[PDB]
């Protein structure tokens, strides 16, 4: 039996504008006599929100526990933990958890890089990459946007923060987006939204488009006159 | 099922914002369907003509004396659509309400306008209400065209191409600069369905100011 | 119509287009191209607002700081509605006059001793008071 | 992919990515080597293998290297070799430069 808890990210919290607690827990036999719990620091039980899912090809069962408290107990530093009874396990689990204190905040960059040259040779699909760097914490949410309707989830992949080798605190993250070439070489805009905590209005955004890229050609003009004083 | 007769917005500043209260038949009740996107929130705001909707959000019930009882159906609403009774409901059934959180909607105060210095008014300077504050508009682009569609949506009749000679009688202002770079094509039917820059950005001064004089 | 206007600065005279020429057929092998179109005043001064300023022999023009965007844009999030910054980029000389602003100024005039200063057209024609 | 041009503008360093997919199983092995010689294994990261979601059982990850921006201008050269069972010879290379691109032209009008 093996129990996971994650905590609510800031992600979650700047759409679902709801804070919720989960306690993963896998490798279940007996689905009728489990019990999961929330409780606080002093003693005092949270309703909870258990939903069974569906069988799985291990024998096993899987089950989801939601606990909803708003966020001006939690980001004071109060503390949770989660049990989970079995009447096979002689004692109960305990897993805590908590958000931590005391982390800088640094603004992170966006770059967009084009597609390669190399890629829409073979006439079969795109890729445009967002990427987000120098941020702390490790917390960063991406979504991509057309005409300002977002696109579907699996048109794009987004990975954890990881660490950078050469400064220390600071971490990168990175998206990626497959588009098809006829597309591209028709024209259509792109648009990459990151939101960290660290911005100064929590929101950036970027563009990319096939025009406003690399020119082959600098057409350069310049006119000199002595009586053009003025620019409408 | 019941058809909701309207919607009111209690326990709120003002009536453009705070808690949904749909009017269930005689006695009327607090909802908190699930999949409370923006777009229902819309039509609640389309349904006492506050404006656009801005924020929807559920807060955690810590004595909030939530006295209404809940709904038994679901308002999935497309939010382009009409008023809340053109759009699908469920056949009654069991609440989606499982975590007793109340649902939260954030309108936007509506539009207004007006002519502040000229006599028996349809003249003037030009301030328009816009986060409660009233707020001059440059004339950095004031073509003909953008002088007309004021004048009918006060029914201040066809403007007489006054120039600039009578609008040095207004004055300047002293408000914020709320709309810059406006441009008025069609006669659409009110001055923010133009394009303009951005409510509070500008590159002008208040001696630079836009004077409307109608026919009155 | 087969260009699209990028910036269109007045105090540089600055304008940038964007084109692109479906050069043969082949998808993959057209050009783009980009024009630039500057206009130098060669009887301005280092100041545009002071006539005793010395003249200016000296133009630069960073494209970096032309092309830029600094206005919040609003963004749909199915929740809510928030601005976005459009750069992190975000005192600049203006070489040439606004035909949209006007450029005043203030000169001591005597006449049988007092002295009565009073503001001035430094533009020929611009806007009237 | 060749760094970004406002990340060499602003002057602290270049972003250097080696985008590797279309391999099958997942068993991949990417390093870096400059002027022949390979690089410490502390000077690039690297990723993880993680299924597409497009294409039902294939695999991809990066690599990514920091290079000081005088050492990018000076002309130094990079590349990003690869090695896959399923390759002829279990060896693959890509590589780019500054110099690595299109010629471009510069028809400049002075109108006296
Ligand atoms: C260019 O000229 C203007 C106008 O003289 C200078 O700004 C003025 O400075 C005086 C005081 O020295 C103020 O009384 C004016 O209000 C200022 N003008 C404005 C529009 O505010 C400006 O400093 C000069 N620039 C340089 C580089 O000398
Ligand atoms: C050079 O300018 C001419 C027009 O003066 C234009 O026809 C031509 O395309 C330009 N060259 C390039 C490479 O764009
Ligand atoms: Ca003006
Ligand atoms: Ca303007």
Not at chain 1, 108 to 115: E, F, G, K, T
Not at chain 1, 116 to 138: D, K, Y
Not at chain 1, 166 to 177: D, K, N, V, W
Request: charged letters at 25%.
């Amino acid at each position: 039996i093996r129990v996971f808890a994650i905590p609510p990210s800031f992600a979650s919290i700047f759409l679902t504008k709801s804070t919720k607690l989960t306690c993963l827990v896998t490798d279940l036999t007996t689905y009728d006599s489990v019990t999961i719990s929330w409780t606080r620091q002093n003693g005092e039980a949270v309703k909870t929100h258990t939903n069974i899912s569906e069988s799985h090809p291990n024998a096993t069962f899987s089950a989801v526990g939601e606990a909803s408290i708003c966020e001006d107990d939690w980001n004071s530093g109060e503390r949770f933990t989660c049990t989970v009874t079995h009447t096979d396990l002689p004692s109960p689990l305990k897993q805590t958890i908590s958000r931590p204190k005391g982390v800088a905040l640094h603004r992170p960059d966006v770059y967009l890089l084009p597609p390669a040259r190399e890629q829409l040779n073979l006439r079969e699909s795109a890729t445009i990459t967002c990427l987000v760097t120098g941020f702390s914490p490790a917390d960063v949410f991406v979504q991509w946007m057309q005409r300002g309707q977002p696109l579907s989830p699996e048109k794009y992949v987004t990975s954890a923060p990881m660490p950078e080798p050469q400064a220390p605190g600071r971490y990168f993250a990175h998206s990626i987006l497959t588009v098809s070439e006829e597309e591209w070489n028709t024209g259509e805009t792109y648009t990459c939204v990151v939101a960290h905590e660290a911005l100064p209005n929590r929101v950036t955004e970027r563009t990319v488009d096939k025009s406003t890229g690399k020119p082959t050609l600098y057409n350069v003009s310049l006119v000199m006159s002595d009586t053009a004083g003025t620019c409408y | 099922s019941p058809v909701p007769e309207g919607v009111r917005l209690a326990d709120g500043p003002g009536h453009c914002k705070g808690r949904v209260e749909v009017k269930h038949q005689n006695q009327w009740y607090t909802v908190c369907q699930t999949g409370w996107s923006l777009r229902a929130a819309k039509v609640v705001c389309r349904q006492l003509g506050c404006g656009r909707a801005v924020l929807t959000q559920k807060r955690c019930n810590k004595h909030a004396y939530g006295r209404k009882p809940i709904w038994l159906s679901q308002m999935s609403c497309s939010g382009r659509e009409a008023t809340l009774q053109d759009c699908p409901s469920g056949p009654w059934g069991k609440n989606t309400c499982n975590h007793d959180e109340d649902t939260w909607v954030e309108c936007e105060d509506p539009f207004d306008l007006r002519l502040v210095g000229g006599d028996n008014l349809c003249s003037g300077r030009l301030e328009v209400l816009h986060k409660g504050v009233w707020g001059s508009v440059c004339d950095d682009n004031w073509g003909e065209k953008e002088d007309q569609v004021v004048c009918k949506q006060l029914g201040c009749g066809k403007s007489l191409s006054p120039s600039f000679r009578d609008r040095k009688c207004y004055g300047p202002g002293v408000g914020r600069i709320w709309l810059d770079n406006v441009r008025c094509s069609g006669e659409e039917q009110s001055l923010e369905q133009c394009q303009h820059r951005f409510w509070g950005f500008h590159d002008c001064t208040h001696q630079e100011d836009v004077a409307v004089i109608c026919s009155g | 119509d087969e260009r699209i206007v990028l910036v269109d600065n007045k105090c540089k005279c600055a304008r940038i287009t964007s084109r692109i020429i479906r050069s043969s057929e082949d998808p993959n092998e057209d050009i783009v191209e980009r024009n630039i179109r500057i206009i130098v005043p060669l009887n301005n001064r280092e100041n545009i607002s002071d006539p005793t300023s010395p003249l200016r022999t000296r133009f630069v023009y960073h494209l970096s700081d032309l092309c830029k965007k600094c206005d919040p844009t609003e963004v749909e999030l199915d929740n809510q509605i928030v601005t976005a910054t459009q750069s992190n980029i975000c005192t600049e000389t203006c070489y040439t006059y606004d035909r949209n602003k006007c450029y005043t100024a203030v000169v001591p005039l005597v006449y049988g001793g007092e002295t009565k200063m009073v503001e001035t057209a430094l533009t020929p024609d611009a806007c009237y008071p």
